[PDB]
Amino acid sequence: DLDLASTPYKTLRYHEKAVRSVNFHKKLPLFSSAADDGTIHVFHATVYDDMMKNPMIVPLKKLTGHKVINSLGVLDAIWHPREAWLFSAGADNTARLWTT
Amino acid sequence: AREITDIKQFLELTRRKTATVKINKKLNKPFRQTKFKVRLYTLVGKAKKLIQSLPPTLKVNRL
Amino acid sequence: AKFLKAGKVAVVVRGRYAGKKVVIVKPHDEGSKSHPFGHALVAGIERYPLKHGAKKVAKRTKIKPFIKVVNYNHLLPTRYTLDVEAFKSVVSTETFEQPSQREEAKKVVKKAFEERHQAGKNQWFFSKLR
RNA sequence: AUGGUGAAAGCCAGCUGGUGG
RNA sequence: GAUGGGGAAGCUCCGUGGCCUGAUUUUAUGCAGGCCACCAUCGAAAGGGAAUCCGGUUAAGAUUCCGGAACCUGGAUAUGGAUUCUUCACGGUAACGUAACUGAAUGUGGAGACGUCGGCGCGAGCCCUGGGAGGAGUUAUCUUUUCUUCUUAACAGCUUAUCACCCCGGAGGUUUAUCCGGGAUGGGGUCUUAUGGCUGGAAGAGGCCAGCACUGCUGGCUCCGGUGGCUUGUGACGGCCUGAAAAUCCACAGGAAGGAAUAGUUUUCAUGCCAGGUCGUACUGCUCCAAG
């Protein structure tokens, strides 16, 4: 939080391996997190900024499918500009697209 | 006394016993700048956004 | 060629790791695009396996390994050698410089050394320099 | 008498010319 | 200088234990073992030593009083994290680095803590002044003239490294002053922050002016530069025979000790709280600052 303090406001540790890609959705408030364990998660955030209040964050659901190869899982991901669709890549020479 | 540049950090101190607001003038074109200090912490429509949002449990005197 | 082939024992000299014995997995005399010079790949133990009630024994036998590339200038040649192919599959040039495979290689090395100090073999490697 | 008190080395250029002091 | 002792009948003289472990210690509730090496004290208000700076106050006081803002020693501690899903973490080959990330005996290292002198880089004070903003003065002779004000603290984060050190290299670089090399010239980097710039402190302080009150207030300015001799602190080199002691802090080799299921261990991490005694302290004054 660039307005609260230098240190992170909150930290997550549910990931079982190194986190490789984290990006913000261009339109929606959701942000995705992926790691080498082949697990992808998406969190909703209360981006409200009309008042001096911290944003509330909630998990949505777990995602998987990027089998770990050579200990490497999800390599990179990117959010769709306008809809809650996520593109993911992995070490298995395969990429997966997730939709509602 | 520290170079705090965070607004919510200052608000936490205010919400944590009287503040003060300082007004200064400078040119780069001429421009106005203001400071907010509490008991030392001194933060650098920012003035309105800060003052109007101040909790009623605090007293602030200009200059 | 040089005698610093796979399985050759070595000791770190710089990076504050001096005194920690390491085992050479594979040498690179010509180096690579990164580190274009003679440098070897080595693995070692950060903590040595130093009327017991069978509980302190497990703690003593616990080993914390480390893996890192080291230049020839920071290696002490050793007159001893031991088996290294037991974990060459996970410890390789590709594994270095790319997570999280470093953690898996460290875990494999830890398991191998825990299953090596027990039923003593290659004792000189597990000896800490005072 | 008794018992106390005080005080020019070096180095640069071609033996000759130079720098440091 | 007492003290373990020794002369002198004699006042008097000479001589320079406190720590750890154990089921409570088998003929029965009476104590066993292991560590190390010595001699108190006094003697420095110019030595070492943890810590405060700006403005104002008097009939005498202040770095003590006040207004403002920090620093150092010690302790219960309270919260969050870290230690990682579980038992004392990592990154780069490297100089090295992280907010934290247990360390007993035993040995060692750094600071403390160490002569004298020559030169040079750097911060910065002084001498000088350019442009500009206000006050004062000469002025029959010439003078866009002479004086005068333009100030920025302890402390904390950035930023800042001569020196020193690390990777490629394989036959000249360099100081004021001759110093370095078969590992140099060069290319690529790390670090000890001396004092340099920023901000907060801090313009609300102080100072330079104008106005009116008839016992104060209201308006502005307090700016932007430069290099040409004196000075100080430090850094880095170079000439000659070893220039103190102790107190106190930190680290290193060390791996005994302790670490899990209605809070595993700790708080060299961050925030917060409390206390910090006695004396000297006014004045005068062998030793301190010195413009052109």
Coordinates of C-alpha atoms (C1' of nucleotides) in Angstrom, one line a residue:
Chain A
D1 CA 0.0 0.0 0.0
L2 CA 1.7 3.1 -1.2
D3 CA -0.4 5.3 1.1
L4 CA -0.2 3.3 4.3
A5 CA 3.4 2.4 4.9
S6 CA 6.5 1.2 3.0
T7 CA 6.0 -2.4 4.3
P8 CA 3.2 -4.4 2.7
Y9 CA -0.2 -4.0 4.3
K10 CA -0.9 -7.7 4.0
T11 CA 0.9 -10.8 2.8
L12 CA -0.2 -14.2 1.6
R13 CA 1.7 -17.5 2.0
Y14 CA -0.7 -20.1 0.7
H15 CA 1.5 -20.6 -2.4
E16 CA 3.4 -23.9 -2.3
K17 CA 6.2 -22.7 -4.5
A18 CA 7.9 -19.6 -5.9
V19 CA 5.4 -17.0 -7.2
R20 CA 6.2 -16.4 -10.9
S21 CA 3.5 -14.0 -12.2
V22 CA 1.1 -11.5 -10.5
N23 CA -0.8 -9.0 -12.6
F24 CA -3.8 -6.6 -12.2
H25 CA -6.9 -6.8 -14.3
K26 CA -7.2 -3.8 -16.7
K27 CA -10.9 -3.2 -15.9
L28 CA -12.0 -5.5 -13.1
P29 CA -10.5 -5.2 -9.6
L30 CA -9.5 -8.9 -9.6
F31 CA -5.7 -9.7 -9.5
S32 CA -4.3 -13.2 -10.2
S33 CA -1.4 -15.0 -8.6
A34 CA 0.6 -18.0 -9.9
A35 CA 3.5 -20.0 -8.7
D36 CA 5.8 -22.9 -9.8
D37 CA 3.4 -25.3 -8.0
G38 CA 0.9 -25.1 -10.9
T39 CA -1.7 -23.3 -8.8
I40 CA -3.5 -20.1 -9.9
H41 CA -5.7 -18.0 -7.7
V42 CA -7.8 -14.8 -8.2
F43 CA -8.7 -12.3 -5.4
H44 CA -11.4 -9.6 -5.4
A45 CA -10.3 -6.3 -4.0
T46 CA -12.3 -3.3 -2.7
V47 CA -10.4 -0.7 -4.7
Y48 CA -12.6 2.0 -3.3
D49 CA -10.5 5.2 -2.9
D50 CA -13.2 7.8 -2.1
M51 CA -12.2 7.7 1.6
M52 CA -9.1 7.1 3.7
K53 CA -9.8 3.4 4.0
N54 CA -7.7 0.3 3.3
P55 CA -8.9 -2.1 0.6
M56 CA -10.5 -5.3 1.6
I57 CA -9.4 -8.5 -0.3
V58 CA -11.1 -11.9 -0.5
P59 CA -10.1 -15.1 -2.3
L60 CA -12.4 -16.4 -5.0
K61 CA -11.4 -19.9 -6.0
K62 CA -8.4 -22.2 -6.7
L63 CA -7.2 -23.1 -10.2
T64 CA -4.9 -25.8 -11.4
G65 CA -3.8 -27.7 -14.5
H66 CA -0.2 -26.6 -15.1
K67 CA 1.6 -29.8 -14.1
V68 CA 5.0 -29.1 -12.6
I69 CA 7.9 -30.1 -14.8
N70 CA 11.5 -29.8 -13.6
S71 CA 10.1 -28.1 -10.5
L72 CA 8.7 -25.3 -12.7
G73 CA 5.0 -24.6 -13.0
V74 CA 3.2 -21.4 -14.2
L75 CA 5.7 -19.2 -16.0
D76 CA 3.7 -16.2 -17.0
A77 CA 0.1 -15.0 -17.3
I78 CA -1.9 -12.0 -18.6
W79 CA -5.4 -10.7 -17.9
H80 CA -7.9 -10.1 -20.7
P81 CA -8.5 -6.3 -21.2
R82 CA -12.3 -6.3 -20.6
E83 CA -13.5 -9.6 -19.2
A84 CA -12.5 -12.0 -16.4
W85 CA -10.5 -14.3 -18.7
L86 CA -6.9 -15.3 -17.9
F87 CA -4.2 -16.7 -20.1
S88 CA -1.6 -19.0 -18.4
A89 CA 1.7 -20.7 -19.5
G90 CA 3.6 -23.5 -17.9
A91 CA 6.8 -25.5 -18.1
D92 CA 4.9 -28.4 -19.8
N93 CA 5.1 -26.6 -23.2
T94 CA 1.4 -25.9 -22.9
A95 CA -0.7 -22.8 -22.3
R96 CA -4.3 -22.7 -20.9
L97 CA -7.1 -20.1 -21.1
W98 CA -9.6 -19.8 -18.3
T99 CA -13.1 -18.5 -18.7
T100 CA -16.2 -18.2 -16.5
Chain B
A1 CA 11.2 14.2 12.6
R2 CA 11.2 12.0 9.5
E3 CA 10.6 12.3 5.7
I4 CA 7.2 10.7 5.8
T5 CA 5.5 11.0 2.4
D6 CA 2.4 8.9 3.2
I7 CA -1.0 10.3 3.8
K8 CA -2.6 7.4 5.6
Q9 CA 0.5 7.1 7.8
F10 CA -0.2 10.7 9.0
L11 CA -3.9 9.9 9.4
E12 CA -3.1 6.9 11.6
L13 CA -1.0 9.2 13.9
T14 CA -3.9 11.7 14.0
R15 CA -6.4 8.9 14.7
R16 CA -4.0 7.4 17.3
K17 CA -2.9 16.0 21.2
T18 CA -3.3 18.9 18.8
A19 CA -2.2 19.2 15.2
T20 CA -1.0 22.2 13.2
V21 CA -1.1 23.2 9.5
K22 CA 1.6 25.3 7.9
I23 CA 1.3 27.3 4.6
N24 CA 4.4 28.2 2.5
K25 CA 4.9 29.9 -0.8
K26 CA 7.6 28.9 -3.4
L27 CA 8.4 29.2 -7.1
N28 CA 9.9 26.8 -9.6
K29 CA 6.1 29.5 -11.7
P30 CA 4.9 30.6 -8.3
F31 CA 3.0 27.9 -6.3
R32 CA 1.6 27.3 -2.8
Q33 CA 2.5 24.4 -0.5
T34 CA 1.2 23.3 2.8
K35 CA 2.4 21.0 5.6
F36 CA 0.5 19.0 8.3
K37 CA 2.3 18.2 11.6
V38 CA 1.3 16.1 14.6
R39 CA 3.1 15.2 17.9
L40 CA 7.8 14.8 15.2
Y41 CA 5.8 13.9 12.1
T42 CA 5.1 16.4 9.3
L43 CA 3.4 15.4 6.1
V44 CA 4.3 17.2 2.9
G45 CA -6.9 19.6 -3.3
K46 CA -4.6 17.7 -0.9
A47 CA -5.2 20.3 1.8
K48 CA -9.0 20.0 1.5
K49 CA -8.9 16.2 1.3
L50 CA -6.9 16.1 4.5
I51 CA -8.6 18.7 6.6
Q52 CA -12.2 17.8 5.7
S53 CA -11.4 14.2 6.5
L54 CA -9.9 14.9 9.9
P55 CA -11.7 13.1 12.7
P56 CA -13.7 15.4 15.1
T57 CA -11.5 14.2 18.0
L58 CA -8.6 16.4 17.0
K59 CA -8.0 20.2 17.2
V60 CA -5.9 21.9 14.5
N61 CA -4.6 25.5 14.6
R62 CA -3.3 27.2 11.5
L63 CA 0.3 28.5 11.4
Chain C
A1 CA 41.5 -32.0 -19.3
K2 CA 41.8 -31.7 -15.5
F3 CA 41.4 -34.0 -12.5
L4 CA 38.5 -31.7 -11.3
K5 CA 35.9 -34.0 -12.8
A6 CA 32.5 -35.0 -11.4
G7 CA 32.6 -36.3 -7.9
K8 CA 35.8 -34.5 -6.9
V9 CA 35.8 -33.1 -3.4
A10 CA 36.3 -29.3 -3.0
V11 CA 36.1 -26.6 -0.4
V12 CA 34.7 -23.0 -0.9
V13 CA 37.1 -20.1 -0.3
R14 CA 35.0 -16.9 -0.7
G15 CA 31.5 -15.6 -0.1
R16 CA 31.8 -16.3 3.7
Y17 CA 31.2 -20.0 2.9
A18 CA 34.9 -20.7 3.3
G19 CA 35.5 -23.9 5.3
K20 CA 32.3 -25.6 3.9
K21 CA 33.2 -28.8 1.9
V22 CA 31.5 -29.2 -1.4
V23 CA 31.3 -32.0 -4.0
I24 CA 31.9 -31.2 -7.7
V25 CA 29.0 -32.4 -9.9
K26 CA 30.4 -31.4 -13.3
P27 CA 33.2 -29.0 -14.5
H28 CA 33.0 -26.3 -17.2
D29 CA 36.5 -25.4 -18.3
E30 CA 35.3 -23.2 -21.2
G31 CA 32.4 -21.8 -19.1
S32 CA 29.2 -20.5 -20.8
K33 CA 27.7 -17.3 -22.1
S34 CA 27.3 -16.4 -18.4
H35 CA 30.6 -16.7 -16.5
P36 CA 32.7 -17.2 -19.7
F37 CA 35.6 -19.0 -18.0
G38 CA 36.6 -22.2 -16.1
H39 CA 34.0 -22.6 -13.4
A40 CA 32.7 -25.8 -11.6
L41 CA 29.3 -26.8 -10.2
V42 CA 29.5 -27.9 -6.6
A43 CA 27.2 -28.9 -3.8
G44 CA 27.8 -29.1 -0.1
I45 CA 26.4 -29.0 3.5
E46 CA 25.7 -25.7 5.3
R47 CA 25.5 -27.5 8.7
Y48 CA 27.4 -30.7 9.3
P49 CA 25.7 -33.9 10.8
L50 CA 27.2 -33.7 14.3
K51 CA 23.1 -42.0 26.2
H52 CA 20.9 -40.5 23.5
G53 CA 17.1 -41.0 23.9
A54 CA 16.8 -41.5 20.1
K55 CA 15.4 -38.0 19.7
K56 CA 18.6 -36.0 19.8
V57 CA 20.1 -38.5 17.2
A58 CA 17.6 -37.4 14.6
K59 CA 18.4 -33.7 15.2
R60 CA 22.1 -34.4 15.0
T61 CA 21.8 -36.3 11.8
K62 CA 19.8 -33.5 10.2
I63 CA 21.7 -31.8 7.3
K64 CA 21.1 -28.5 5.6
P65 CA 22.6 -28.6 2.1
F66 CA 23.4 -25.8 -0.3
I67 CA 24.1 -25.7 -4.1
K68 CA 26.0 -22.9 -5.9
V69 CA 28.4 -22.5 -8.8
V70 CA 31.9 -21.6 -7.9
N71 CA 34.9 -20.4 -9.9
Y72 CA 38.1 -22.3 -10.0
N73 CA 39.8 -19.4 -8.1
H74 CA 37.6 -20.1 -5.0
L75 CA 38.1 -23.9 -4.8
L76 CA 40.6 -25.9 -2.9
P77 CA 41.6 -29.1 -4.7
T78 CA 41.0 -32.2 -2.6
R79 CA 42.6 -35.7 -2.7
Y80 CA 39.2 -37.4 -2.0
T81 CA 36.2 -38.3 -4.1
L82 CA 32.8 -39.8 -3.6
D83 CA 29.7 -40.9 -5.6
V84 CA 27.8 -37.9 -7.1
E85 CA 25.5 -39.4 -9.8
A86 CA 22.9 -40.2 -7.1
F87 CA 21.5 -36.7 -7.5
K88 CA 23.0 -35.5 -10.9
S89 CA 19.5 -35.7 -12.4
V90 CA 18.2 -32.9 -10.3
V91 CA 21.5 -31.0 -9.9
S92 CA 22.7 -29.8 -13.3
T93 CA 23.6 -26.7 -15.3
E94 CA 20.0 -26.2 -16.3
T95 CA 18.8 -26.3 -12.6
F96 CA 21.2 -23.6 -11.6
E97 CA 19.9 -20.0 -11.9
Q98 CA 16.3 -21.0 -12.3
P99 CA 13.8 -21.4 -9.4
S100 CA 12.1 -23.2 -7.9
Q101 CA 14.3 -26.2 -9.0
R102 CA 16.9 -25.0 -6.6
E103 CA 14.7 -25.9 -3.7
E104 CA 14.0 -29.4 -5.1
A105 CA 17.7 -29.9 -5.7
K106 CA 18.4 -28.9 -2.1
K107 CA 15.8 -31.3 -0.8
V108 CA 17.2 -34.1 -2.9
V109 CA 20.7 -33.4 -1.6
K110 CA 19.4 -33.3 2.0
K111 CA 17.7 -36.6 1.6
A112 CA 20.8 -38.2 0.0
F113 CA 23.1 -36.9 2.7
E114 CA 20.7 -38.0 5.5
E115 CA 20.7 -41.4 3.9
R116 CA 24.5 -41.3 3.5
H117 CA 25.6 -40.2 7.0
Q118 CA 23.6 -43.1 8.3
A119 CA 25.4 -46.3 7.4
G120 CA 28.6 -44.4 7.3
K121 CA 30.3 -43.9 3.9
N122 CA 32.5 -41.1 2.5
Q123 CA 33.3 -40.0 6.1
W124 CA 35.8 -37.4 5.1
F125 CA 33.1 -35.3 3.4
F126 CA 31.0 -35.2 6.6
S127 CA 34.0 -33.9 8.6
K128 CA 33.9 -30.3 9.7
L129 CA 37.1 -28.3 9.6
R130 CA 37.8 -26.6 13.0
Chain D
rA1 C1' 72.8 19.7 72.2
rU2 C1' 67.5 18.1 72.3
rG3 C1' 62.5 17.7 69.5
rG4 C1' 60.0 19.4 65.2
rU5 C1' 59.3 22.7 60.5
rG6 C1' 60.5 24.2 55.6
rA7 C1' 63.1 23.7 49.7
rA8 C1' 72.0 18.6 1.1
rA9 C1' 69.6 12.6 0.1
rG10 C1' 66.2 11.8 -3.6
rC11 C1' 64.5 11.8 -8.6
rC12 C1' 63.7 14.3 -14.4
rA13 C1' 66.2 16.0 -19.1
rG14 C1' 71.1 16.3 -22.4
rC15 C1' 79.7 15.4 -16.2
rU16 C1' 75.9 20.2 -17.7
rG17 C1' 70.8 21.9 -16.9
rG18 C1' 66.3 20.8 -13.4
rU19 C1' 62.3 19.3 -8.9
rG20 C1' 61.8 18.4 -3.0
rG21 C1' 63.6 21.6 1.0
Chain E
rG1 C1' 50.0 2.0 49.8
rA2 C1' 48.1 -1.7 53.4
rU3 C1' 48.5 -6.8 53.1
rG4 C1' 51.6 -12.6 53.7
rG5 C1' 56.3 -11.2 57.0
rG6 C1' 60.7 -9.2 59.1
rG7 C1' 64.0 -5.1 62.4
rA8 C1' 63.4 -1.3 66.1
rA9 C1' 63.0 -1.0 74.1
rG10 C1' 60.2 2.9 71.5
rC11 C1' 56.9 7.0 68.8
rU12 C1' 57.9 3.5 64.6
rC13 C1' 61.1 1.5 60.0
rC14 C1' 61.9 -2.2 55.6
rG15 C1' 59.3 -5.4 52.5
rU16 C1' 54.7 -4.6 46.6
rG17 C1' 36.9 -17.4 45.6
rG18 C1' 33.6 -16.9 43.2
rC19 C1' 31.4 -19.9 39.3
rC20 C1' 28.9 -24.6 37.4
rU21 C1' 27.0 -29.5 37.8
rG22 C1' 23.8 -33.7 41.1
rA23 C1' 17.0 -37.7 41.1
rU24 C1' 19.0 -36.4 47.9
rU25 C1' 25.4 -38.2 48.7
rU26 C1' 22.5 -47.4 49.0
rU27 C1' 24.4 -50.6 55.0
rA28 C1' 20.0 -45.6 54.7
rU29 C1' 18.1 -38.4 55.4
rG30 C1' 26.4 -35.6 58.6
rC31 C1' 28.0 -33.5 50.7
rA32 C1' 30.4 -35.0 46.2
rG33 C1' 32.5 -33.6 41.9
rG34 C1' 34.7 -29.9 37.7
rC35 C1' 36.9 -24.3 36.0
rC36 C1' 40.7 -20.6 36.5
rA37 C1' 44.8 -18.4 38.1
rC38 C1' 46.5 -12.8 41.5
rC39 C1' 46.6 -9.3 45.9
rA40 C1' 42.8 -4.1 48.1
rU41 C1' 42.9 0.9 47.9
rC42 C1' 44.5 6.0 46.5
rG43 C1' 46.6 8.7 42.6
rA44 C1' 44.2 12.7 35.5
rA45 C1' 38.4 18.8 36.5
rA46 C1' 44.6 19.3 29.8
rG47 C1' 44.3 11.3 29.1
rG48 C1' 40.0 7.3 27.6
rG49 C1' 34.9 7.8 28.6
rA50 C1' 26.9 7.3 26.7
rA51 C1' 24.1 11.0 25.3
rU52 C1' 21.2 18.2 23.3
rC53 C1' 20.6 21.8 19.7
rC54 C1' 17.9 27.0 17.8
rG55 C1' 15.2 31.7 19.9
rG56 C1' 13.9 34.6 24.4
rU57 C1' 14.3 35.8 29.7
rU58 C1' 17.5 39.4 34.2
rA59 C1' 19.2 43.9 39.0
rA60 C1' 23.1 39.1 38.7
rG61 C1' 21.3 32.9 35.5
rA62 C1' 21.4 29.3 31.9
rU63 C1' 23.7 24.2 26.5
rU64 C1' 20.6 24.4 33.9
rC65 C1' 15.0 28.8 33.4
rC66 C1' 11.3 29.1 29.7
rG67 C1' 9.3 28.2 24.0
rG68 C1' 10.6 24.5 20.2
rA69 C1' 12.8 20.0 18.7
rA70 C1' 16.3 15.1 19.7
rC71 C1' 19.8 12.1 21.9
rC72 C1' 22.3 7.9 25.7
rU73 C1' 22.1 3.7 30.0
rG74 C1' 18.8 0.2 32.3
rG75 C1' 13.7 -3.0 32.8
rA76 C1' 8.9 -5.1 32.9
rU77 C1' 7.3 -5.5 29.0
rA78 C1' 2.3 -4.9 25.1
rU79 C1' 1.4 -5.6 19.7
rG80 C1' 3.0 -7.1 14.7
rG81 C1' 6.4 -9.9 12.1
rA82 C1' 10.6 -13.1 11.5
rU83 C1' 11.9 -18.3 12.5
rU84 C1' 7.4 -21.6 8.0
rC85 C1' 4.2 -25.1 8.1
rU86 C1' 6.3 -27.0 10.5
rU87 C1' 12.5 -27.2 14.7
rC88 C1' 17.5 -22.2 14.4
rA89 C1' 16.6 -18.3 6.7
rC90 C1' 19.2 -16.7 2.1
rG91 C1' 21.3 -14.0 -2.8
rG92 C1' 25.7 -13.0 -6.6
rU93 C1' 31.6 -17.1 -8.8
rA94 C1' 33.4 -13.2 -6.5
rA95 C1' 34.7 -7.7 -3.3
rC96 C1' 29.9 -8.2 -0.4
rG97 C1' 24.7 -7.7 1.3
rU98 C1' 19.4 -8.5 4.3
rA99 C1' 14.8 -5.1 9.5
rA100 C1' 14.7 -10.3 12.2
rC101 C1' 16.9 -15.4 11.4
rU102 C1' 19.3 -19.0 19.7
rG103 C1' 24.8 -19.5 21.1
rA104 C1' 28.2 -22.2 27.6
rA105 C1' 32.9 -23.1 28.7
rU106 C1' 37.3 -22.4 26.2
rG107 C1' 41.5 -18.7 22.7
rU108 C1' 41.7 -14.7 19.4
rG109 C1' 40.6 -10.0 16.7
rG110 C1' 38.5 -4.7 15.9
rA111 C1' 37.6 -0.1 18.4
rG112 C1' 39.3 2.0 22.9
rA113 C1' 44.8 2.5 21.8
rC114 C1' 48.9 5.8 20.6
rG115 C1' 55.6 9.4 17.9
rU116 C1' 57.4 13.2 14.8
rC117 C1' 57.5 16.0 10.1
rG118 C1' 57.0 17.5 4.2
rG119 C1' 53.6 17.9 0.4
rC120 C1' 48.4 17.4 -2.1
rG121 C1' 42.6 16.4 -2.9
rC122 C1' 38.1 17.6 -0.4
rG123 C1' 34.1 20.0 3.0
rA124 C1' 33.8 24.6 5.2
rG125 C1' 35.1 29.7 8.0
rC126 C1' 37.8 34.3 6.7
rC127 C1' 39.5 38.1 3.0
rC128 C1' 36.7 39.9 -2.3
rU129 C1' 32.8 40.8 -5.2
rG130 C1' 28.9 40.3 -9.7
rG131 C1' 23.3 40.8 -10.5
rG132 C1' 19.0 42.1 -7.4
rA133 C1' 15.9 43.7 -3.1
rG134 C1' 15.6 47.8 1.5
rG135 C1' 18.2 51.9 5.0
rA136 C1' 22.1 55.6 5.5
rG137 C1' 26.2 59.6 3.6
rU138 C1' 29.3 62.8 0.6
rU139 C1' 27.6 65.5 -3.8
rA140 C1' 29.3 73.8 -7.3
rU141 C1' 34.0 70.6 -9.4
rC142 C1' 34.3 63.8 -11.1
rU143 C1' 31.6 59.7 -9.3
rU144 C1' 25.0 54.2 -12.4
rU145 C1' 29.2 56.3 -5.9
rU146 C1' 30.9 54.4 -0.1
rC147 C1' 28.9 51.8 4.3
rU148 C1' 25.1 48.6 5.6
rU149 C1' 21.1 43.3 6.0
rC150 C1' 20.2 39.3 2.7
rU151 C1' 21.1 33.9 8.7
rU152 C1' 19.8 27.8 8.7
rA153 C1' 21.3 23.8 14.7
rA154 C1' 21.7 18.9 17.5
rC155 C1' 19.2 15.1 15.1
rA156 C1' 16.7 11.1 10.9
rG157 C1' 16.2 9.1 5.4
rC158 C1' 18.0 9.5 0.8
rU159 C1' 22.3 10.9 -1.9
rU160 C1' 27.9 11.0 -1.8
rA161 C1' 34.1 7.0 -1.7
rU162 C1' 40.0 9.1 -2.1
rC163 C1' 41.6 4.6 -0.1
rA164 C1' 40.9 -0.6 0.2
rC165 C1' 39.1 -5.2 -2.2
rC166 C1' 36.6 -8.8 -6.4
rC167 C1' 35.9 -11.1 -12.3
rC168 C1' 38.4 -11.1 -18.1
rG169 C1' 43.4 -10.2 -19.5
rG170 C1' 48.8 -12.2 -20.6
rA171 C1' 53.8 -8.2 -21.7
rG172 C1' 53.6 0.3 -19.4
rG173 C1' 50.7 3.2 -15.5
rU174 C1' 51.9 7.0 -11.8
rU175 C1' 52.8 11.3 -7.3
rU176 C1' 54.0 17.9 -5.4
rA177 C1' 57.9 14.5 -4.1
rU178 C1' 59.5 7.8 -7.7
rC179 C1' 56.0 4.4 -6.5
rC180 C1' 53.5 -0.2 -8.8
rG181 C1' 53.7 -4.8 -12.7
rG182 C1' 54.4 -12.1 -16.4
rG183 C1' 50.4 -10.0 -13.0
rA184 C1' 50.5 -4.2 -15.4
rU185 C1' 48.0 -0.6 -19.2
rG186 C1' 42.5 -1.4 -20.0
rG187 C1' 37.3 -3.3 -19.5
rG188 C1' 33.5 -4.9 -15.7
rG189 C1' 32.2 -4.3 -10.1
rU190 C1' 32.0 -4.2 -4.3
rC191 C1' 32.7 -1.7 0.1
rU192 C1' 34.3 1.5 5.2
rU193 C1' 30.1 7.7 4.5
rA194 C1' 35.0 11.2 6.8
rU195 C1' 31.7 15.9 5.1
rG196 C1' 29.5 17.7 0.3
rG197 C1' 23.0 18.6 -2.1
rC198 C1' 17.5 17.6 -0.7
rU199 C1' 13.9 17.7 2.2
rG200 C1' 11.7 17.7 8.0
rG201 C1' 13.6 20.4 12.0
rA202 C1' 12.6 25.4 9.4
rA203 C1' 10.5 30.1 9.0
rG204 C1' 6.0 29.8 13.1
rA205 C1' 12.7 31.4 14.8
rG206 C1' 15.8 35.6 14.2
rG207 C1' 17.1 39.8 11.1
rC208 C1' 16.0 44.3 6.8
rC209 C1' 12.2 47.9 5.8
rA210 C1' 6.9 50.7 5.4
rG211 C1' 2.3 52.0 8.0
rC212 C1' -0.7 53.4 12.0
rA213 C1' -1.7 52.8 17.4
rC214 C1' -0.3 55.5 22.4
rU215 C1' 1.1 50.2 24.1
rG216 C1' 0.9 46.6 19.9
rC217 C1' -0.4 45.2 15.6
rU218 C1' -0.7 44.9 10.2
rG219 C1' 2.0 44.4 5.2
rG220 C1' 6.3 42.8 2.3
rC221 C1' 12.2 41.3 1.8
rU222 C1' 15.2 37.7 4.1
rC223 C1' 17.3 35.9 -3.3
rC224 C1' 20.6 33.9 -7.5
rG225 C1' 26.0 33.5 -8.0
rG226 C1' 32.1 33.3 -8.6
rU227 C1' 36.4 32.1 -8.5
rG228 C1' 41.5 34.9 -6.9
rG229 C1' 45.0 35.0 -0.9
rC230 C1' 44.7 33.5 5.2
rU231 C1' 42.4 29.2 8.1
rU232 C1' 40.5 24.6 10.0
rG233 C1' 39.0 19.1 10.2
rU234 C1' 39.9 14.9 7.6
rG235 C1' 41.6 11.6 3.8
rA236 C1' 45.4 9.5 1.1
rC237 C1' 51.2 9.3 0.2
rG238 C1' 56.2 10.0 1.5
rG239 C1' 61.5 11.0 5.1
rC240 C1' 64.0 9.1 11.3
rC241 C1' 65.0 6.2 16.1
rU242 C1' 58.7 1.0 18.0
rG243 C1' 56.0 6.8 21.5
rA244 C1' 51.8 4.4 27.5
rA245 C1' 48.0 1.8 31.1
rA246 C1' 43.1 0.5 32.4
rA247 C1' 37.9 0.8 32.1
rU248 C1' 33.8 -0.5 28.3
rC249 C1' 31.2 -2.3 23.4
rC250 C1' 31.2 -5.7 19.3
rA251 C1' 32.6 -10.2 16.3
rC252 C1' 35.1 -14.5 15.2
rA253 C1' 36.7 -20.9 15.9
rG254 C1' 33.1 -23.6 19.1
rG255 C1' 28.3 -27.0 19.0
rA256 C1' 27.0 -28.7 25.1
rA257 C1' 22.3 -26.6 26.0
rG258 C1' 16.6 -25.6 24.4
rG259 C1' 12.8 -25.7 20.5
rA260 C1' 5.2 -28.5 18.7
rA261 C1' -0.5 -29.6 18.3
rU262 C1' -6.9 -24.6 22.4
rA263 C1' -0.4 -20.1 21.6
rG264 C1' 6.8 -25.1 19.7
rU265 C1' 11.6 -21.3 21.3
rU266 C1' 13.4 -16.0 20.8
rU267 C1' 12.3 -10.8 20.3
rU268 C1' 20.8 -8.0 18.2
rC269 C1' 13.5 -6.6 14.1
rA270 C1' 9.6 -2.5 14.4
rU271 C1' 6.3 0.4 17.5
rG272 C1' 5.0 1.8 22.7
rC273 C1' 6.1 2.7 28.5
rC274 C1' 8.9 4.2 32.9
rA275 C1' 13.2 5.9 35.8
rG276 C1' 17.8 7.9 35.3
rG277 C1' 20.9 10.0 41.9
rU278 C1' 25.2 13.6 44.5
rC279 C1' 28.5 17.6 43.9
rG280 C1' 30.9 22.0 40.7
rU281 C1' 27.7 26.0 38.1
rA282 C1' 27.5 34.0 39.9
rC283 C1' 32.3 37.6 39.4
rU284 C1' 37.5 38.5 38.8
rG285 C1' 40.5 35.2 36.2
rC286 C1' 49.4 28.7 33.9
rU287 C1' 45.7 28.3 29.2
rC288 C1' 41.9 29.8 24.1
rC289 C1' 40.1 33.4 18.7
rA290 C1' 42.6 36.9 16.2
rA291 C1' 40.1 42.0 9.6
rG292 C1' 42.0 45.1 6.2

